[PDB]
Amino acid sequence: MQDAITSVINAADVQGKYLDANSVEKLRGYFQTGELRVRAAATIAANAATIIKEAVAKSLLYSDITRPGGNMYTTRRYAACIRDLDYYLRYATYGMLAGDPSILDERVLNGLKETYNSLGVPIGATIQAIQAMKEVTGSLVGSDAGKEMGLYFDYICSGLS
Amino acid sequence: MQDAITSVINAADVQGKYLDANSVEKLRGYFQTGELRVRAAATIAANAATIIKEAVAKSLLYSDITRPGGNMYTTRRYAACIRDLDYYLRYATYGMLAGDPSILDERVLNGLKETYNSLGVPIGATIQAIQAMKEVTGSLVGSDAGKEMGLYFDYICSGLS
Amino acid sequence: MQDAITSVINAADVQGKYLDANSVEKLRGYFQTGELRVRAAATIAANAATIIKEAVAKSLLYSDITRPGGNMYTTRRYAACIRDLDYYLRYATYGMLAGDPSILDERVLNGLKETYNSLGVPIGATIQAIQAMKEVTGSLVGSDAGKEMGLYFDYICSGLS
Amino acid sequence: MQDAITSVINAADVQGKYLDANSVEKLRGYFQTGELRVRAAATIAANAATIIKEAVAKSLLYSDITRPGGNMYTTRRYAACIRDLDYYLRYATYGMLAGDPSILDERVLNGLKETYNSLGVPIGATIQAIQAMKEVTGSLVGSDAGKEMGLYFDYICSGLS
Amino acid sequence: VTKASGGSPVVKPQLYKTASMLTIAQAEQQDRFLELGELNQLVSFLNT
Amino acid sequence: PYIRGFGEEPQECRNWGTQIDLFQYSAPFRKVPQSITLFSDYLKALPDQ
Amino acid sequence: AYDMDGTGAGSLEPRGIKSSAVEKDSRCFKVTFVLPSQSRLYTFRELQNVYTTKMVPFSSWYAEQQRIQKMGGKILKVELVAGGQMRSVGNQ
Amino acid sequence: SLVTQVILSADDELRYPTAGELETISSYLKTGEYRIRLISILQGKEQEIIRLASKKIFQLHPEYIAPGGNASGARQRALCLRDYGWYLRLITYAILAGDKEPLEKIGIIGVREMYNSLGVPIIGMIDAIKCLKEATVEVISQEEEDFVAPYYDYIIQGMS
Amino acid sequence: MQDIITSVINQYDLSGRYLDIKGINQINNYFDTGLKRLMIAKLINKEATNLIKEASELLFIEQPELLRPCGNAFIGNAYTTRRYAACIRDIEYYLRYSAYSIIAGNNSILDERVLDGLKETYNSLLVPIGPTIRVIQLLKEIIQKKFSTENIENAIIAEPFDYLAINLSDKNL
Amino acid sequence: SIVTKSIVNADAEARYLSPGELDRIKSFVLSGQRRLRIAQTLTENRERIVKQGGQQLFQRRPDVVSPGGNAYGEEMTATCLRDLDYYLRLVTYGIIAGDVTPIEEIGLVGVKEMYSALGTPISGVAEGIRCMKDVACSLLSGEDAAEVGFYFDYTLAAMQ
Amino acid sequence: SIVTKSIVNADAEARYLSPGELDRIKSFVLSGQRRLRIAQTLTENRERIVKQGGQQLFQRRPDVVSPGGNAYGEEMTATCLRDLDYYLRLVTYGIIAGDVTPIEEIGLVGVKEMYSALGTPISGVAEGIRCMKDVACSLLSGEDAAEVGFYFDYTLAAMQ
Amino acid sequence: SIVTKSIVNADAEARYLSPGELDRIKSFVLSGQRRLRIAQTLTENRERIVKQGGQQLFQRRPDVVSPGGNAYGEEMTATCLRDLDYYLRLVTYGIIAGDVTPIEEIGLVGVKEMYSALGTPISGVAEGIRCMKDVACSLLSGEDAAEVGFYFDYTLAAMQ
Ligand SMILES: CCC1=C(C)/C(=C/C2=NC(=C\c3[nH]c(/C=C4\NC(=O)[C@H](C)[C@H]4CC)c(C)c3CCC(=O)O)/C(CCC(=O)O)=C2C)NC1=O
Ligand SMILES: CCC1=C(C)/C(=C/C2=NC(=C\c3[nH]c(/C=C4\NC(=O)[C@H](C)[C@H]4CC)c(C)c3CCC(=O)O)/C(CCC(=O)O)=C2C)NC1=O
Ligand SMILES: CCC1=C(C)/C(=C/C2=NC(=C\c3[nH]c(/C=C4\NC(=O)[C@H](C)[C@H]4CC)c(C)c3CCC(=O)O)/C(CCC(=O)O)=C2C)NC1=O
Ligand SMILES: CCC1=C(C)/C(=C/C2=NC(=C\c3[nH]c(/C=C4\NC(=O)[C@H](C)[C@H]4CC)c(C)c3CCC(=O)O)/C(CCC(=O)O)=C2C)NC1=O
Ligand SMILES: CCC1=C(C)/C(=C/C2=NC(=C\c3[nH]c(/C=C4\NC(=O)[C@H](C)[C@H]4CC)c(C)c3CCC(=O)O)/C(CCC(=O)O)=C2C)NC1=O
Ligand SMILES: CCC1=C(C)/C(=C/C2=NC(=C\c3[nH]c(/C=C4\NC(=O)[C@H](C)[C@H]4CC)c(C)c3CCC(=O)O)/C(CCC(=O)O)=C2C)NC1=O
Ligand SMILES: CCC1=C(C)/C(=C/C2=NC(=C\c3[nH]c(/C=C4\NC(=O)[C@H](C)[C@H]4CC)c(C)c3CCC(=O)O)/C(CCC(=O)O)=C2C)NC1=O
Ligand SMILES: CCC1=C(C)/C(=C/C2=NC(=C\c3[nH]c(/C=C4\NC(=O)[C@H](C)[C@H]4CC)c(C)c3CCC(=O)O)/C(CCC(=O)O)=C2C)NC1=O
């Protein structure tokens, strides 16, 4: 659980040296985007339910995982999805603010693909839901902010694959 | 393993519709940069050994991973690095031509960070080597071509993180 | 945890179709034996302690697992047996009523043979106790009811093997 | 796969220093016992079949793993045991010569307890077979040589536990 | 019921080739860079 | 010898996951045997985990 | 080690090709044969030349010669190019 | 034949034939002449049967007979009965050696690429054999035609 | 695999006892229906290429979505003829291994050669499990059309197809 | 069903089934003939029970179908009736299982999370099931209408 | 059994079962009535078949029971007859399975490793099974003695 | 070492160690007293063996230290001698291990990839080790100089 400042301090500390010009050079780069990330995390908090409603209706709403036999049939199983998609849109918001994807594999990625295989959850449909959820997130926060929030979505999709 | 044309055809095919104006609009955007990518992949093929020699000497040549006890001490371990850095500079060249980073996670990213943790390879020094390798690649191919080749380097660094 | 009706409804539901003639054909077959199973589960509830007392005295009462060094020597260890044999005669009664052995592996079989190996409990003597317990159970409930109750005993013995 | 000399050279090399008085002090201690280990490995090679025949007859020959239902009933399963016990008496001989148990976990211990749980092999009876096999090995090679060969048997028993 | 599981990795089955595609893949398959012919091979298709 | 991938040959349903694992560079670091345990747990009951 | 440990019928490893090759044998033949595949017409794999001439070792000539006839091959000529004859010690 | 399958199948394991296999040879050889008596019945009805096969393969499929189809013309239809003659001759081999190899080493293995390079529609040849099996039932009684029935539909299964 | 017989003999070996008469009564029930189990199998070989064809049209007549574009869910139904060619191929297997398993009188051949990794394989390719199981029982009704006047052949034909249905289900109850 | 949870009740208590539990499994299986007749009535009346079910639902809740309602247009109204076909199906399961255990873990557990997450008024779908109940109980006698209606109102209770 | 390996044979070959395979599963199940009678004879003759089996075994191999033999004393001689009761049991399995597949993976695979590792002369136990064979075939007619003896000599072959 | 690869040799061959392998582990450990004396000579002579090692290296290869050479200036020349201190250290490991196994997987495996990728002339570093060899063997008797020189020339062989 490290942000961009924590990761910069760790690497500069792990060699026992002070924060030289290169370490502060990245820190200044993070502070420049500090204004963009909060407004990105602002609108995502507002439209959390709307984004997840848009992703599932655009990716896996009417596919036969939704029908009987599919992986999402029963109401408990459907309700687990939007609960499950809420974490991806939420933890990706944390990575967008912290500027470092360490929180994702610390709290989301580890034991995740090993868990879906246990339950039999289709990893293929899961990533496309996150990809569609990444597509709507670029709608709200804009282009570059979508590039930032989108940079952690595919990090989840990559490791979850 | 999809290029920009394969990804455009897939999304236009996955809805069962023809290639409308929006699908061809991105395809025309890819054909415009087709001339830039080949010359970018041209010079990178020529200066493959020179780029990797520049990156390691600029990022991790004299650090104490290079010294005894560091992660790169023995000659087998040092030789594995430039073998290992060759794939990052090579597969990034493939992503720069295909215009789609699908080949990276298909053939590089999956099981990569899970493999370095097994061997105990420092992911921190690895990304800075790729960052330094990204810096020299912008020297050769120019600014915008470096922006293209650089766009897949940090994709490796993001997922490898 | 499915009975015969739950398993019939699941397979007929998992294809999204109604209960056709074949699905109801097995359900009628289960309702015909509904009268037999209750009387079978009736007498087994009455003679629970008598059946377990008959099985251990007929299979492993005087063998050298009962003597010092054997797997059943101390009074805590002996008392664990009749506690342990009570579950096999009890859960087999549940399978006989539900008409489906799903409850056994759900609540008995999983982690069972992996547990006895940890404690060092002899699986060989365990199955013969259940086989002897199956033999006395056919005495009480009759032939066909013993065939039904006996059909779940060897299911435990098979998976526990 | 390191012997006592390889482990001494590695630790002295991993700090980048020469072989000081402490590193050679242990190496001299290993060369002193070099005469004892070969004669220990000499007689064990001669009485390999006799030692395994003595261990199984002394530990698990007549127990109910040997009888039907036990873990060792069928002739394929019995024949796998003496094949399996041969590795423990053989690899322990390698550790006794190399003076370092690195070869055991490299080639025996890893994936071993995870494999016996898959097959359902009783780890409890396995360790007592190795303990009995350790007891007969102290008969042949003597006391101190048995202390050396015995020091790697319980290393297998510890990790296999 | 199946009492074990090997896992289901994300696999994308092949659908077709393209001229932009396969010789990016052939030079990939040998673990070598794009060569002048197959890289001039990538060029004159994007000029079409 | 080539690697008989997925789009080479009619594959079998029984070692689907394992073979896709084995045809990766991550294969030489699963020091625990992946196939002998998987083919044996197909017959035994559910494990404790 | 060598292929004649004591294995025969009724033994734990499956009954298979048992060669009379010593420890690290250094004898090898020069064989020549055609071996039509007899399986390409339901597999439709690419075609490979079936007439080969190669040096097989003594350690595994018998398995190869036992297998070349398994799939209908015909052995045109074999010789012992490297190694001695009636040699007690020295085949290693 | 059937003994050849047992000698082969026992030879790749480097063992003599087991107890069950020697049954499979012994039971096959005790039913010996009845295949021999049966094939002489069918050989006397080859001109019987192929005339009836050309009945229904062409009333079912006049596409092939018409001008433009493959079987249009005299000499094309001339060998047309010859392919029935070879197939019926092959089945007499299969009825004798009590298995499918004479129907498989000949006739079945690679039959589609033979016909596809000839222009004969491979679906039409499936109905031709199905037509041939339909024709064999009339000149054969109920006792022995189910003995020869499983040898026909193997050919249909082989051709798909 | 294990037939009804070898499965019965392993039942008595685990307990290490000879075959009693309850054991032999189970074997006799196979030997009685064993002659009836063959023409069920012999009918399948004669009706094999047909019975897949009626199953497909009866399937897509209720699931027209399977012949349509997938939606953006990259799902493997019978969209393209490459998809359709392989997708009919699976119906080959379900009819085949359910044909041997009719003759063995036991579903041991089914799960170890069909069920083991079936949800594994379909979850990778995103294949329909719902329609995949429904086509398995469209075959069952289609095969039972032939043997219908009596009803002791029906339980024989139902046992393999019913076993794949209950086992390919994500358990709702 | 009553059989599976009368077991798992006595399962947890480390005991067998009492006469109170076994005289009701007995009493339920003799009731099984009458249950299949009741479910058989609702099985091939889904055309009227659903279509007249959505009849009164729109007359009582025109907001949900009016422009702005969740089930507005040709599309959503079809799915608007699809859910009623679901819940009518689960009631047929509960009647044959003799309990709402099939209706419990299908269509009831976490149902408010789904419909809240779909934007659908959960009170509106509760009104739909009540309209189906009056159509269903109008198709059966008084002895049956105390059952078929009995499972609907449980679904009404859990759906709010 | 013949049913399971006729399947796994045709299983590996990507095909169904030929008439040669299905006319023998058919021929085996009609043979099943006669097999149970044969196994029923050996089932409750184990008292004589084993005890007279060890009769000739000691009168032919007195070394194994003499002082120094592996089966010396009251203890080992009891286990000396225990193995014969095992192998007599497996022959009853092979007769009902119509094959030595039950005898193959029980008591035959890796049998030389066990008996070599127990110090038992494997040739001696082979002599024991031959003595049981003469007692077994003396209990049955000629048509049966060609079977019951037939499975013993396979066990004799694999046991050396 | 000789102990670890005499094991892994006999490890792969499924056998124990022969007298040829165990009379040399025996012969090596009695040699261990003399090995530590030899390595003890090179241990605290690294000041002269390295500095005089780079003495002859620059007199024989002035290009590498001249302006444009890889080891030009105060900086690279220090690292120019650093590698010689490395390889002199590995020879002390090989003498005590009785084999070039320590020198194999350290400083030899893939050494051409490193020095080619550093721009260093690999032939030049080979000349450096040869200059160290004459200084090392000049510090020991003839019986020892056949060993200490013996490990250098192996490093010379693998370094070109
Ligand atoms: C914070 C990191 C994190 C994640 C991601 C997580 C996931 C997780 N997802 C679960 C289930 C589930 N997940 C799904 C999801 C899906 N079905 C589909 O078809 C889609 C592809 C997908 C929605 C995108 C379903 C249906 C279940 C229920 C499975 C069942 O009842 O068997 C469960 C089981 C327990 C429960 O839901 O209460 C866990 C623990 N846990 C974590 O700690
Ligand atoms: C094509 C995608 C792909 C990658 C990237 C890949 C990596 C990979 N890197 C490896 C090792 C290695 N990688 C390194 C790398 C490094 N040491 C450092 O200090 C640096 C941070 C870093 C160089 C940038 C080293 C030293 C080893 C050897 C580890 C050992 O011997 O224990 C190995 C072990 C086997 C071998 O090298 O033969 C694999 C498989 N495989 C793949 O298929
Ligand atoms: C070199 C390190 C190493 C070990 C140790 C090893 C063990 C190993 N033991 C096995 C089986 C086995 N192991 C046993 C052993 C025992 N039964 C008992 O009751 C005793 C407690 C125990 C004897 C001490 C048995 C009976 C089997 C056969 C299991 C079966 O057929 O299901 C198998 C399965 C395959 C085979 O034997 O061919 C492996 C791989 N593999 C290795 O690479
Ligand atoms: C299935 C058809 C077939 C046959 C027959 C066959 C024979 C064959 N016999 C061999 C050797 C041998 N054969 C013999 C045989 C004999 N010495 C005598 O004095 C006797 C006259 C004779 C025994 C009857 C000997 C001693 C060797 C070993 C030769 C050597 O080590 O140089 C070898 C060399 C390899 C090996 O044994 O592993 C082959 C391949 N291969 C086949 O595929
Ligand atoms: C022993 C197995 C075997 C077969 C079957 C075989 C067939 C065979 N069929 C052929 C032609 C042909 N076969 C047909 C056949 C037909 N037209 C119809 O409508 C019918 C359905 C069908 C016949 C029943 C026609 C029309 C041609 C001539 C095509 C052409 O050359 O234009 C030819 C080219 C030469 C020739 O006629 O002999 C061969 C070799 N060869 C073999 O070795
Ligand atoms: C013996 C048991 C067994 C089965 C069943 C099996 C199935 C199997 N089905 C496959 C693909 C497939 N299967 C389908 C099937 C379907 N699409 C639909 O929409 C329908 C629901 C369904 C037809 C009923 C499709 C489209 C593919 C290709 C997926 C793609 O490439 O897009 C593949 C990958 C291609 C290959 O065969 O190598 C396997 C292995 N393997 C086995 O070993
Ligand atoms: C078996 C238990 C069960 C239920 C109940 C269920 C409901 C369910 N209702 C849905 C949609 C829907 N449901 C409605 C429903 C309504 N609109 C109204 O005005 C009315 C108040 C109400 C119906 C009476 C609408 C309009 C949609 C589409 C919403 C959208 O397109 O955004 C969807 C998403 C599309 C689909 O896959 O069908 C599901 C999964 N799934 C289940 O497994
Ligand atoms: C079903 C296949 C099968 C067989 C055959 C089998 C044999 C078997 N024979 C054993 C012992 C023994 N077997 C013998 C046998 C003999 N002594 C003689 O002189 C004769 C030549 C021979 C008998 C005819 C003796 C003496 C022992 C005890 C050896 C000892 O105590 O060291 C034991 C160890 C004790 C036990 O658990 O019974 C086994 C497991 N297990 C099996 O699962």
Ligand SMILES: CCC1=C(C)/C(=C/C2=NC(=C\c3[nH]c(/C=C4\NC(=O)[C@H](C)[C@H]4CC)c(C)c3CCC(=O)O)/C(CCC(=O)O)=C2C)NC1=O
């Ligand atoms: C233990 C085995 C081992 C070796 C040998 C080794 C070599 C090694 N030599 C290096 C540099 C170097 N090595 C040289 C060497 C030379 N210049 C010349 O003219 C001569 C021909 C030659 C020395 C005799 C120079 C000039 C550099 C610095 C190159 C630069 O700064 O670009 C570096 C990078 C800096 C460092 O981390 O030290 C390594 C890792 N590492 C190892 O682990």
